[model samples]
Target chain A: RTFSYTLEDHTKQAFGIMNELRLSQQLCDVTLQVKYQDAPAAQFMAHKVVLASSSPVFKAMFTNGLREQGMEVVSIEGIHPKVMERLIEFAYTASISMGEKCVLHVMNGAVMYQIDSVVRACADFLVQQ
Target chain B: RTFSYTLEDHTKQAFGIMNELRLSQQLCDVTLQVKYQDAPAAQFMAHKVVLASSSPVFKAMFTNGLREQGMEVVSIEGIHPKVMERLIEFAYTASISMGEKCVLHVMNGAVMYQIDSVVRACADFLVQ
Candidate 1:
């Protein structure tokens, strides 16, 4: 109905609709708990659907009838928390910013997790540096 | 003599292998053929999974037995090509820069697409 609405108000309402949908990723019903092995092995929250789509290891672990399948807190080892943070960010966002300090770490994390585009981005950034 | 591959070398090599995999989005296997109905509709290529995850509308179109399913050219109508371009970019990159001119257009697309984070981001940019 064209009763009373400006284009701006329409856009405002749209965000509320989209915000609920966005929560389905981080705070949705089916969310994953990640305990990265960082000192105390910090716990991080993620969406199963998002993780599975981004990383092979996550896809396999979440599905494949593995032991971790029944568990909520998936223990991630060996990789640094910072690296995993960037990797997770990339998985959800599909982009990353590579500063000199984080370039190699991003490279390592990207390769280890098979997030290819990011690894190439990191590599390309390094050559320019 | 033991040759130690420096972290620099290893990182450089990582990109090469990653390059092959990166092709999966733009140059490999299956990709979405985006045809924007701007005048005659400019065409673009994108990955299905990337779009699906970012927007519920795209997710539904690809999976809900809509005409877009099994078809390569998914037509986006009404929206400006530049606005659509930014939306697609946000789908893959999760980030975008808003200019004074495109703010309203980008805000409209973000709202239509239900990409809330971006919608809020656009709104925030407009007021500030």
Candidate 2:
């Protein structure tokens, strides 16, 4: 049952590229690129917060003191962590297709639980064939 | 149109019920956990990284240790920073559905993504 149709008709899947919202595909575009460094979750959390939360508020009060210094932001995305390993045969490691892990900091009560998606740069991963 | 599968099926789609594999969805649930809590971000990067990356192998090596510590991660799960406020629409403050917003570190990173289907919550998620 190997059939390839050009513009056929099927109720289950009947749409074009523009209608991709209904269609889903596995991806790995979201990149992680900051630098190569590390920190303890505590001190790490503080640094993250100072800019993300504290800085904005502080700026609102100080009125452009920190702004003059060309302050950017205190968030990730700019901090992309490279992966060192790309396992061939692992459980969740293979399951989640763990992309690349970029460790971060967390305050006493930032939120709940959640971790990295990528384990290393060995992206576009599959399994141990 | 007769289909109602459980949260189990598709080796790749198992959120925590059955096996899931290749089957993928559109989500990002990278809730920032503290692998490196002491490190800060750059001028903008320090805060940027301390919140997540830009760390040393030493910190990288201690991720398991952080998990061992009673340290709760600082998270962020509200409207994405990439998300503008306009989407809210105000709408009399009650007409539509309202979502919960939790702040942690990153807004667009993996953890802060909508919601992930953890095959097995090493710790535990919830009834998504």
Candidate 3:
């Protein structure tokens, strides 16, 4: 007997990655460079594969080998350094600890990044608050 | 007002990492070497922090000064290579696709490694 594969079709299987998520944070190979108007330069270590899987924008950039793709450093612009830091953290760990004061900023960043999971989670948190 | 945190009085927060769970598999480091009697050697790549977070056995092994702690290649013993690979994958990604044939073996391995989450998950899956 052998396993058969339908080349053109597949179904989604649900699974969890609680530990792997935390591990990627510790063993991050790539870095996100911050380019902000008000804040000085800062760099965050991350994983390119992980980033691409989480967001479409990243998926294309890393997959197409277009401009600013597959590099050790990628610049994040048009967001506050603080908020950007939180966004990248969320993208990697899928967790964020923010008070009411910065929740909107984070949700905006999540939307911009197309992080649907975080957007909904933040919305729920907002409702709870 | 700025938030104040007293380490001694800190309480745990209940939050989920559904997206991050998927991301970590895409990005992982370290490797698990499977030692078995019936199969050839195999290796499973993973992340150290994630392994520690999931299993207390891994946590202690990685944390304390042990013979096999903090090494790039960690060996998993006394289980089928296939089952061990599945266990390592589950530890990192927390997901496994297995049928009744392998479920008991996996649960046994989970018990061996002290992965309570998977043990409970396998039990739940058995009922459904």
Candidate 4:
């Protein structure tokens, strides 16, 4: 006989793994530096595999023989560090909360990252608001 | 406002990340060596965080100041390499398939690893 866990259970287990990894910052293979026009850049540690799975842009960067394939730190510009933090969190957990202050920025980051689910959620949130 | 994807979407995304990581064997931090009584040992590469999150036994082995904490390769005995392979797969994907030939062994490995969902599924499979 074949057996399987519920989608919710799978999601919970996957989220648990990613959350623990993110918190521990263990075995992280990449660093994303969020650069600002006038302010200092903020860096976030992450797993390249996780980012590749979530975003085609990231997939291309890590694969496809791109320059990021050899770089230890990938620089991201035109996004605030706070907004970039939320995007990284969303990449790992597939969940995020936003207020009026940063929703648009979050949406912009999501768009640039090409995370379709986040982009869709941000669009829905804006329409509802 | 609060926003979230569907459970299926979350599972798919999470599984995608893990599946890719497992396949690429990139940034893996630990190695599990399956020792056999008569044959040579087989090794599997994995992430410590993934194993710790899935099994309390692994969590303790990694975090409880145990001897395994300092070791690069953690040796597991009594479970066949094939059976241990399935267990590792379940740990990463929360999914596995078994035949009557190896179901019991798979169940045993799941119990030893303390993956409740896999143990439950194996039990249910046995009953039905």
- Clashing pairs counted in every model: 0, 58, 0, 0
* Candidate 3 structure quality by residue, lDDT tens digits, B1-128: 22111111101111123224334433344567888887898876665545655566776665556333223677777888787766665643445667667777888888887877668767765676
lDDT of 2: 0.20
TM-score of 3: 0.53
Worst 10 residues of 4 chain A by lDDT: A63-72
When summed lDDT is taken over every stretch of 10 residues in candidate 1 chain B, the lowest stretch is B1-10
| Model 1, span A1-129: residue lDDT tens | 011112323222322333334444322213333444444444446545355555666655654543332126555666777667767655444445545676787688778777766667777777866
**Scoring each candidate complex against the real one, what DockQ results?**
0.03, 0.02, 0.06, 0.31
Measured with C-alpha atoms, the lDDT of residue A16 in candidate 2 is 20
DockQ, 0 to 1 scale, candidate 4: 0.31
Q: What C-alpha lDDT values do all the predictions have?
A: 0.53, 0.20, 0.56, 0.71
| Model 4, backbone clash pairs (residues 3+ apart or across chains), number | 0
Question: Rank by TM-score, descending?
Answer: 4, 3, 1, 2
Candidate 4 clashes between residue pairs 3 or more apart in a chain or in different chains: none
Q: Which candidate is the best by TM-score?
A: 4
Question: CA lDDT of B95 in candidate 4?
Answer: 70
Q: Which is the better candidate, 2 or 4, if ranked by TM-score?
A: 4
Greater DockQ among 2 and 4 belongs to 4
Q: Report the candidate with higher TM-score, 2 versus 3.
A: 3
Docking quality level of the chain pair in candidate 1 = incorrect
